């Protein structure tokens, strides 16, 4: 009986592919290939944040564009005052294996997670003087890859046990479970309305979900390898995608298909982090070959090279005002350019 | 141009980084090892004098001049390519092989072939522990080892079978900067901490010689 259902699914996916093909008239070529080039972009080393004694695996910027959170394998979560190259807090972690970190938009909470399958939240503004654990969220059967804050009470985490979950910090329960993504969900990005988010996984799929619902609405496809990074456009209608096949793309929510792809012939290392500028014109992509090169989100052009990392870059971040970019590698030193 | 609050914030930062340096000095003298193997391959009883501290299991004990830490990495059913780079700076990888299970022997061989040629494990040495040798030698009369490993000749003795298994395990090694340490041990063998200590100090000496341009 499953043969008829499989045939119906094959007919539906053939119709979907035909619809994407027929909607792909006046395509990515010669629609954005009519404007001026971005030019030459060179960023000098303004800051070199030091203080970790292990590999930095994550980094998130504050919404004041003043404070950073870097969580590393040494069991330490240092909160950095970037304007003066300064340390504000140092939170000893119970489990040193960490693959993600978050910063609440209010500036009050930071999140952390890793191979302990626990998203542990921390409270910075306390009337005791030190950062304490506020709640330990457990219930996944796999490691957590990326956590992003919606407000002071709701967290959404992407984990490697083929699921994503939205929690509430007060009671520590999974309000919404986002089933799908047969591979391991490896990244997550929030649109600038706290309503819809994207999530890539190892099974080469970039689904789009809704927070107020519990199901997908657009399943982008087209990568031939693993995914590692994802990032929305400032409009809220597009997103980028970094992957293990040295291929960073731009996708389109309205068209339900794939816009221009910025890949290079000589590059073979995987992409670990992608990020967008304030206007969305400049895309910064991390690279596993000890480098982090910039591109253009409209045309294919290597506008510049940001070099200086002794090890692999695993976290890249652009502030809300877009004033500075943070680049963190496994050399225990993370850099801020201009 | 610095204010009073700025000065006291700089002092707080100095205290934070001094405590960070103290913690890094304290934690550098701990040997980190990565236990591996098949299901029920003797990982839970590698050392009978260990204290235990889910995603992964961490167990620690102290022997002579060094403090040991073991990562069982059990229950991590996810893809074994996304969190291996977390365990890239381990000094040694303890692989446990159970000679008793003939069905799961090829699973252990496949795992050994996977981990001994990974990009993150090109330099990390491996301390083999051919566990469960007593009942293996007890059952070596009925089973001649050719039911699971063909293309060999021998007297179906314990020594030759152990040598053949060890040779098959070392045949999956393709690296000029790594040495596999093999040590047959019993389930009643209390002498396991000294084997790991000798192997680990030999590994550290070998790594120091490698880094200086020597062997």
């Amino acid at each position, epitope marked *: 009986e499953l043969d008829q259902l499989r045939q119906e699914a094959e007919q539906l996916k053939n119709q979907i592919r035909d619809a994407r093909k027929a909607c792909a008239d006046a395509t990515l070529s010669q629609i954005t290939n009519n404007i001026d080039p971005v030019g030459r972009i060179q960023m000098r080393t303004r800051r070199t944040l030091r203080g970790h004694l292990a590999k930095i695996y994550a980094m998130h910027w504050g919404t004041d564009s003043r404070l950073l959170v870097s969580a590393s394998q040494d069991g330490k979560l240092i909160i950095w005052d970037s304007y003066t190259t300064n340390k*504000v807090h140092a939170i000893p972690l119970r489990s040193s294996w960490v693959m993600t970190c978050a910063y609440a938009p209010s500036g009050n909470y930071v999140a952390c997670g890793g191979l302990d399958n626990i998203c542990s939240i921390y409270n910075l503004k306390t009337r005791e003087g*030190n950062v304490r654990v506020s709640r330990e969220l457990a219930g996944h059967t796999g490691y957590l890859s990326c956590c992003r804050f919606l407000d002071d009470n709701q967290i959404v985490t992407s984990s490697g046990d083929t699921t994503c979950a939205l929690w509430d910090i007060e009671t520590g329960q999974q309000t919404t479970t986002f089933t799908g993504h047969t591979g391991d969900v490896m990244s997550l990005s929030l649109a600038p309305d706290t309503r819809l988010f994207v999530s890539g996984a190892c099974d080469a799929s970039a689904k789009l979900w809704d927070v107020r619902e519990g199901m997908c609405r657009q399943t982008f496809t087209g990568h031939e390898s693993d995914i590692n990074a994802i990032c929305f456009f400032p409009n809220g209608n597009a997103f980028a995608t970094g992957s293990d096949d040295a291929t960073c793309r731009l996708f389109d929510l309205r068209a339900d298909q794939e816009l221009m792809t910025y890949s290079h012939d000589n590059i073979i290392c995987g992409i670990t982090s992608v990020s967008f500028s304030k206007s969305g014109r400049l895309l910064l992509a991390g690279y596993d070959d000890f480098n982090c090169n910039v591109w253009d989100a409209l045309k294919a052009d290597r506008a510049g090279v940001l070099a200086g990392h002794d090890n692999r870059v695993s976290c890249l971040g652009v502030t809300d005002d877009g004033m500075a970019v943070a680049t963190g590698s496994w050399d225990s030193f993370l850099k801020i350019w201009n | 141009t610095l204010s009073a609050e700025d000065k006291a914030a700089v002092e707080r930062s100095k205290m934070i980084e001094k405590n960070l340096k103290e913690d890094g000095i304290s934690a550098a003298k701990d040997v980190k090892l990565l236990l591996l193997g098949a299901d029920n391959s003797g990982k839970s009883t590698i050392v009978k004098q260990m204290k235990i501290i889910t995603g992964i299991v961490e167990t620690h004990f102290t022997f002579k001049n060094l403090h040991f830490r073991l990562f069982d990495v059990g229950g991590q059913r996810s893809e074994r390519k996304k969190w291996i780079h977390c365990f890239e700076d381990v000094t040694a990888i303890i692989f446990c092989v159970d000679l008793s299970d003939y069905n799961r022997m090829h699973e252990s061989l496949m795992l050994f072939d996977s981990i001994c040629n990974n990009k993150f494990f090109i330099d990390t040495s491996i301390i083999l522990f051919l566990n469960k040798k007593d009942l293996f030698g007890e059952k070596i009369k009925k089973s001649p080892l050719t039911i699971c490993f063909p293309e060999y000749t021998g007297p179906n003795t314990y020594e030759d079978a152990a040598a053949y298994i060890q040779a098959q395990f070392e045949s999956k090694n393709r690296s000029p900067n790594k040495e596999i340490y093999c040590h047959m041990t019993c389930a009643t063998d209390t002498n396991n901490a000294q084997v790991i200590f000798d192997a680990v100090t030999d590994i550290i000496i070998a790594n120091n010689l490698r880094g200086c341009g020597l062997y």
Partner: single-chain antibody
Amino acid sequence: VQLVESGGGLVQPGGSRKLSCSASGFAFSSFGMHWVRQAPEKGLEWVAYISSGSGTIYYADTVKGRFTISRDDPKNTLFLQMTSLTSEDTAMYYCVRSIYYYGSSPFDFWGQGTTLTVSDIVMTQATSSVPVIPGESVSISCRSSKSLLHSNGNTYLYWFLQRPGQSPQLLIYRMSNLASGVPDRFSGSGSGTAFTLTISRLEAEDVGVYYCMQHLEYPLTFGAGTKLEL
């Protein structure tokens, strides 16, 4: 979180006393604790200071060479050892906690004082007997000998409310930042050497004396005090 200060009492004009205060509820080593005295019918005055981990110890002009401050971090106790007690030291001695990082709120908790009996920047604020009506717009002013703005973009001026029979409580820090637990009616604004606390819709539990503080140059300067009547 509660600070209890013990000791004090009568002393001969030339003797010595060693006041001590203890904390129970917050991490002591992360806070730079202060000593602030209050004459029985006058304003507040800064006395002593010790940093986190005893890394910096500052004294006042009337405190240098005569007093000393120490803290016992393992036992969570702050010590004030005073020598050559004159008759001008007859004051109630307050223990004040303070933390310093980006976004901190220094001088956010005060301990109940110790009555002692022995038998720069200049700031002068407003009037001292203003007729507060319950429910109004009251603009308590302040002044300074300098424009208290640094290159960091932070203007430093603190507002304290002393209820009758109670220790001072922080209301506004930096220049316009509400402290935690302060209701939204309290609001402050100003510029260099011109500061005003605009209290709108005055209510109960607001009568008392209002104080300023500078925190650019470290020897602390208060104001005389503006008192809300009725």
